[PDB]
Paper text:
The tetrameric transcription factors [name], p63, and p73 evolved from a common ancestor and play key roles in tumor suppression and development. Here we determined the crystal structure of the zebrafish [name] tetramerization domain, which contains a second helix, reminiscent of p63 and p73, combined with [name]-like features. Crystallographic studies on the zebrafish [name] tetramerization domain then confirmed the presence of the p63/p73 signature helix in [name] proteins of a subgroup of bony fishes, providing evidence that the last common ancestor of [name], p63, and p73 also had an extended domain with an additional helix that was subsequently lost in many modern-day [name] proteins as a result of divergent evolution.
Size-exclusion chromatography multiangle static light scattering (SEC-MALS) showed that residues 302–345 form stable tetramers. We then determined the X-ray structure of this domain in two different crystal forms at 1.97 Å and 2.2 Å resolution. Crystal form I belongs to space group C2221 and contains six chains in the asymmetric unit: one tetramer and one dimer that forms the same type of tetramer upon applying the crystallographic symmetry. Overall, the zebrafish [name] tetramerization domain adopts the canonical tetramer structure of human [name], which is composed of a dimer of primary dimers with approximate D2 symmetry, but importantly, it has an additional helix that engages in subunit contacts, reminiscent of p63 and p73. Individual subunits within the tetramer adopt a z-shaped conformation, consisting of a short β strand followed by two α helices (H1 and H2). The sharp turn between the β strand and helix H1 is facilitated by a strictly conserved glycine (Gly311), whereas the turn between the two helices is stabilized by a proline (Pro332) at the N-terminal cap of helix H2, which is strictly conserved in p63 and p73. Key intersubunit contacts in the canonical region are conserved, most notably the salt bridge between Arg314 (Arg337 in human) and Asp329 (Asp352 in human) that stabilizes the primary dimer. Depending on the mobility of the C termini within the crystal lattice, we were able to build the model of helix H2 starting at Pro332 up to Met344. This helix reaches across the adjacent primary dimer within the tetramer, resulting in antiparallel packing of two H2 helices. Tyr339 plays a key role in stabilizing the H2-mediated subunit interface.
Residue numbers in the entry:
A (entry chain D): 302 to 342
B (entry chain C): 302 to 340
C (entry chain E): 303 to 343
D (entry chain F): 302 to 339
Write the structure that this text describes.
């Protein structure tokens, strides 16, 4: 999945919230083994 | 000021980011002097 | 109840501290006060 | 490289910030090369 639109005022909050949102989405698709491997280097 | 929108997957995630948004806004409009006192 | 969050690196620390400081502020500003401050927008 | 600590009030807030931390650490190490791959 259900998809919501978050309204954000200004570039500063937008950039912070996009960064968080994009990070959370990345963690939903990178496999646990791949994630650990990236974290080692 | 410009309004941006973000597509958020999942209700729980939406509620966390909206809460951060609202708290970030508040922190941007409370002067530091007022904030230290409230703290 | 108070928890300690361990953070690696100054850039992640500054982002997380900003979020945490902001949440704490939203806790101690009364609702009517908060409303009057939001007018600026 | 520096290690930092943050005092968080309340377990649900701790859970939120911990997840953001863990996510952000992954985002910092996944290269651009592999971006379309996920
Ligand atoms: Zn600001």
């Amino acid at each position: 999945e259900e998809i919501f639109t978050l309204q954000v005022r200004g570039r500063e909050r937008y950039e912070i919230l996009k960064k968080l949102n994009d990070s959370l989405e990345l963690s939903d698709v990178v496999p646990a083994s791949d994630a650990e491997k990236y974290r080692q280097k």
